[PDB]
Amino acid sequence: RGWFDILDDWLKRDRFVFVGWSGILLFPCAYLALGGWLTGTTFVTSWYTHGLASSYLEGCNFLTVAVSTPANSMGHSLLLLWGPEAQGDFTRWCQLGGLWTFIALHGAFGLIGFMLRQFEIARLVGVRPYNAIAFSAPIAVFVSVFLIYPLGQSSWFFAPSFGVAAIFRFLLFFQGFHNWTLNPFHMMGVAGVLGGALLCAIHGATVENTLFQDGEGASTFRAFNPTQAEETYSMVTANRFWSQIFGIAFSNKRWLHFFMLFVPVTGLWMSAIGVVGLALNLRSYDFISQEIRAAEDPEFETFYTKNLLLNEGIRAWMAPQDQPHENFVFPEEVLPRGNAL
Amino acid sequence: DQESSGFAWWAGNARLINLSGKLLGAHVAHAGLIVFWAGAMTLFELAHFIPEKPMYEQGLILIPHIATLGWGVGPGGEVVDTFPFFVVGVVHLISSAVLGFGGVYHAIRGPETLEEYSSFFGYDWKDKNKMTTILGFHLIVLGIGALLLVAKAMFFGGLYDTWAPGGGDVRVITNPTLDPRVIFGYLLKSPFGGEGWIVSVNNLEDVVGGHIWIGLICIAGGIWHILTTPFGWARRAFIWSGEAYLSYSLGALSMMGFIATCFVWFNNTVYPSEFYGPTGPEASQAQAMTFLIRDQKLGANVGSAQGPTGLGKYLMRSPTGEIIFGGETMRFWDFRGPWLEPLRGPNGLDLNKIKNDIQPWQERRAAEYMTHAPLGSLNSVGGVATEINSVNFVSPRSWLATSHFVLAFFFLVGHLWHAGRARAAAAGFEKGIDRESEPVLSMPSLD
Amino acid sequence: GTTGERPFSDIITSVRYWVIHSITIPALFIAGWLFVSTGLAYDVFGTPRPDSYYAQEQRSIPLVTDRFEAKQQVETFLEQLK
Amino acid sequence: SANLWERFCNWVTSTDNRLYVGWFGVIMIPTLLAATICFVIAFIAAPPVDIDGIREPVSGSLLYGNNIITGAVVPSSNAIGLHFYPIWEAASLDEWLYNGGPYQLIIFHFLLGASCYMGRQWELSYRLGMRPWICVAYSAPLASAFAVFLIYPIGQGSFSDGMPLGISGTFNFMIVFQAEHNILMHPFHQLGVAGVFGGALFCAMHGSLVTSSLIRETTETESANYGYKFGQEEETYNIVAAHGYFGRLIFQYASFNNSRSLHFFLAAWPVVGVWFTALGISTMAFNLNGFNFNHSVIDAKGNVINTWADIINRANLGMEVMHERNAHNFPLDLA
Amino acid sequence: VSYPIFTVRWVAVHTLAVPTIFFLGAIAAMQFIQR
Amino acid sequence: AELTPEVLTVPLNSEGKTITLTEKQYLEGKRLFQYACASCHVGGITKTNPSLDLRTETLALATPPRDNIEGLVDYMKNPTTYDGEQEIAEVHPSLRSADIFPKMRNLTEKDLVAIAGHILVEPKILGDKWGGGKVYY
């Protein structure tokens, strides 16, 4: 009909790599995000930013490389290539960690585009959008952790830097400063991811070892009817198995599969809320009743008190080279340490 | 001959389950790869080997195996002649070509099956006798081998005895413990702290002695199987098939793999700290030795020193009363070692010997072993995870122990997997539930 | 089971393909190589050369300390180097 | 009586039992009841345990000041190391509870039973005519409990270094582990998180794809679940519509159409990944730790140029330097 | 069939294909820098 | 920011006279220092006796002075206690005891000079790091 419907027509055309309206947002961003990372990983440094070598060009390996956050001076600045900081200049932008907000913000839109895609492709193919609902979980994580979090802190500098090792310190930090492992929400988080990776494994095996024989071969893979018809595995046998070994067992594939969506998506949602709270530093650091008894009574010791001391050490020995902008100077005598070590 | 209408590509080797001949090429070609390695690696080690430097500081794991059998070494594990190393290496490397020949031959030219090209070699998995017999042949070959060691030790040269009276040295064992009460005693030993089971072997007589028993006991069973068939239970108990037999041998290796991991990690005797590194406990012990030795020279009375907790900076007591080194090292009070024994009394570390019988060679032994504990990183950076780069080293004992726990493990999975397959294969459902006769459907509802 | 695109398999096998890419691929490679080896990359990304982290004596870090006059501050850091 | 024992064996092995007490079960059921019963009592009323062998009792039970999150069953003493400490090895229970005896009684019975639990996951599959291997999936989580409760202690020389039985006690095991082994920088742990992250990921993929491509048979105001009856002949979702959507999300050949290959992958991934994670802990149990890139990148003069690998080392030193305050008397931590 | 050349798939394939090799080339070169 | 010959100029003897090492000797020392020292002196400390380090000042107050090529060299041949009132060649690697510490057999006067030079050059580059321990890592 008209240019719009013709533009549409073209886009929604069934190619090898479906484009679609969504693609107009997805691909530009998704590629820029992936690109910026791959660029910084090998070329840009984090010297003027964290006093750290962070690229292959400097000597870092796939584990130690990363696109480090901007200085703490920048604050929450969007750090646009043409903004007050970089001032249109590219190299400076690079040295001021412009590549972080670049990857961050771009990838962010890229996750919007992608979920939209699922939504758009779902609609076309005429299937229900539970693949999109599910993907809300990963959005929440990215949003709360790479955006909401540092937005509550002093600046982007405390957001997780893009890189393998550069993420491990994000972990260690959270233990040491937020005592994050003791947080009810992080726990739910893991219960879901850990519990989700169980349903995955357990359901898979239950199916492969509860299959009907539809072939004469040993390699039963070929024996499958790509064109529906009968259930390829004995749902009835599976039920009896677990009902006798675990005591409880599914018996409604519709529920067994919905459950599998729920468990890990709910888990990640919870782990997000916990972090949205760590933004304001509203952590789950201590148990007051415990601290009070530990003060008055020097012989009371739990695996909890023990941990808190591990945190003190993490904070004292890391803070210096981890928060350069604070020009920390901790005399050897002030550094907490046990005996001998 | 055999393609996809046998098994899937990635399960290819199972297409040889019933082609005795070709299934022989595999085993003969494979056994070639092991000799090839053993040989080719030894020369690699020797090519890098530096005489005047610890073996453990050179990433060696074969030369130290030869050294233990008393070859190219002398007083204290000093390397004398590198020839036996070069020899053992090249010889194997050659035999690899011979075997490899046969393998390739039997797998792509010779008979694809054996039963007809000679009924002696051809075989039938369910042939309880052929099986019991071939097993019997191998049970003898292994038995001779066990004696091949007893010989090298008693007649041909000896073995490296670190406990050597005059101090570590190659010694000829001419008095193997044959007393069954003792030999087999080991098997009745706890596998926990202190009583360590097999790994507690601590002198060459038992090693040699015990191997004498195994060699005989082994060949004896080799003849017995040659001359027999499984009884009744032996038959109503096991599964008789190509896979089932495999499985049984899989679980067997797994177990030997775990036992080996602990031997190289704990044992001091058959794994001399002189060629490998100091044991885990041995190194923690040496730190205590080192500092009790140091501070004592500065005028400290080790016997009465009180540490932060009020337990005893240098010396404390174990749960059953014996005097041991203090500190976290209290967990390794079961460590025994040439260098440290002369300080032990009838009640454990003697405060008088510690006070004036410590010898320099011991002080530097303790120092050496202290600074060569089995702590290191994947990229080989010796020390604690927080250490700095410089000393490129990872104890041979760490390498061996980890590699073999992984292998030992996966093999236990291998066992479960091939055993699970064999039981379903036998009864016959390893390809799916009979759409028609679905067993579960004939059973009452537990409800 | 199909769309317009010419089945990769066919292309990765066409002698035309290799006749084209045997030229193109190494082309791109040698280019990037030179990008690094000519020191150009260092300037495109303000990344320090092994001899440009600190001034000879100084052992302090060139930490950018304020957003707006950042670029200016960075430039001055390059001034001590040499 | 067709023969008592003959009968017994028919019951035990009976596939008509609500819960299949198998042959492996005969060992499982008792060991697991002991482990469970001892734990629950311990966790609630056990008194302080001198975990580090330095006479500095760590109380970890509810009645002694702990809450669910902090409370735990504390590991046997370090004075004990790897020695066997059965109740009949103590002058009294008072002595046994002080040296952390309950810990061993629990870990040993649990590990024992949890293995038979695997042996059972095979047996029932056999008595039911289904293919084995499910028990092989369960070998991963088991191989972990083993690594964390036995291998690591054997390797380290003491049961006091095994993972405690409690929430916070576990975080302790982790935080310290990291300090002494730098696990986050080890290939095996990474494969572990790939498997776990991936699992949860895939678990969500499958779960959604399927649930979203279900054939309509339900009302607008009726649980979409009822559209399935236990004991159906044909499938309850359009696996061809599922593949149709997912193939377009990414691209066709990068999408499953074979339910069997889908489900194998679904099981293979996590199990394989966790297998490596378990081998990681079992490997770092002999001190072959993660990559140590401390002071790798250095400049033209020799100055040390830090990488994130170094910022990680500081955080590790803090842990090293503060764990086990009073347990060390010497320079190097070789235990 | 009479398949075309420059297609949408082609574009994509190159957006990732081209840069990659350019990087693999860059990196391969770094392996020789020193001090 | 480089290892100039200006940095490789370290005191040769007690009477102020100096010597200038070359980037070859340096690297060579560094390699030798790893081959026969790191084991116990990694990063300038001393694992089997943390009280004595290789910090130049520590070596300055040693007895005799061991903060110059001549000094360290003598030491690597005939080692003594910090007051020099006792020879320790029996429990410390040295030339007069290579039979006991093989790693010291190859070592020739050329090598001893490099190792010595490294010890005086390192702190010049690393500074506080060289002496202190984990606190500075």
Ligand SMILES: CCCCCCCCCCCCCCCCCC(=O)OC[C@H](CO[C@@H]1O[C@H](CO[C@@H]2O[C@H](CO)[C@H](O)[C@H](O)[C@H]2O)[C@H](O)[C@H](O)[C@H]1O)OC(=O)CCCCCCCCCCCCCCCCC
């Ligand atoms: C469901 C199915 C799942 C399937 C999963 C399959 C997973 C398969 C994992 C397979 C293999 C893991 C292999 C590990 C190899 C380790 C090699 C190594 O340790 O090699 C060590 C060497 C050496 O490192 C070097 O170590 C060196 C020095 O040591 C020393 O050397 C110096 C002199 O040169 C001095 O003497 C010094 O004192 C001494 O200590 C230097 O420090 C170097 O600077 C340092 O770079 O390794 C290096 O450089 C290494 C750079 C390494 C990058 C490594 C990545 C490793 C694993 C990644 C897994 C990713 C998974 C992703 C999954 C995604 C989706 C599933």
Ligand code: CLA
């Ligand atoms: C490690 C040892 C090993 C061995 C000994 C074998 C042996 C064998 N395999 Mg496997 N296989 C292996 C590993 C191994 N395989 C692995 C890792 C995989 C997974 C990729 C497979 C997958 C597989 C499949 C899918 C199939 C086999 C089959 C076979 C048989 C094939 C006969 C044939 O067609 O020859 C063909 C041989 C050639 C074309 C050339 C090979 C030459 C080899 C022998 C040597 C190369 C070395 C060197 C050049 C020789 C120098 C020798 C020296 C003395 C001079 C044979 C007995 C087939 C079968 O089961 O049939 C019943 C089959 O279908 N295998």
Ligand code: CLA
């Ligand atoms: C590791 C096990 C192994 C086994 C079980 C076999 C088994 C067999 N082989 Mg091989 N073979 C092997 C390894 C093995 N081979 C290797 C490594 C090579 C390469 C060197 C060969 C090369 C080979 C060839 C070229 C031929 C066979 C043949 C045969 C079959 C002969 C049956 C027959 O008709 O009567 C023959 C009776 C015998 C072969 C037994 C006599 C063995 C004597 C000659 C040598 C024993 C070895 C050694 C010298 C003893 C140690 C002495 C000590 C002092 C050091 C038989 C099934 C033949 C065949 O295909 O038949 C159908 C054939 O032509 N094999």
Ligand code: CLA
């Ligand atoms: C090297 C491999 C090897 C292999 C594969 C076999 C295999 C076999 N042998 Mg044999 N044997 C061997 C070496 C070997 N033997 C040697 C060297 C000797 C000389 C002593 C013998 C002497 C021998 C005799 C005298 C007999 C067999 C028999 C049998 C068959 C027994 C079936 C059975 O139920 O066993 C499984 C064993 C059991 C079910 C018993 C349970 C024992 C419990 C108490 C402990 C199990 C171990 C424990 C859980 C962990 C280890 C503890 C540690 C302290 C040992 C079987 C096919 C029997 C047969 O029928 O021969 C024709 C028979 O009577 N063998």
Ligand code: CLA
């Ligand atoms: C000790 C002897 C042993 C023997 C003789 C066999 C023999 C056999 N196994 Mg088996 N297995 C073993 C141990 C053993 N296994 C162990 C310890 C495990 C636990 C992991 C398994 C797990 C296992 C499974 C899960 C399966 C088999 C299968 C099979 C059959 C496969 C046919 C084939 O084509 O190979 C296939 C070989 C390959 C496809 C090669 C790929 C190997 C990959 C997975 C790992 C490579 C590891 C290497 C170290 C990595 C280096 C990479 C490099 C780039 C650096 C065959 C009869 C298959 C079957 O159908 O059995 C009836 C099957 O599905 N096995």
Ligand SMILES: CCNc1nc(NC(C)(C)C)nc(SC)n1
């Ligand atoms: C049947 C729907 N297709 C499909 N494809 C894929 N492909 C990967 C690579 C994610 C396993 N996964 C799923 S969910 C297990 N489904």
Ligand SMILES: [Ca+2]
């Ligand atoms: Ca230079």
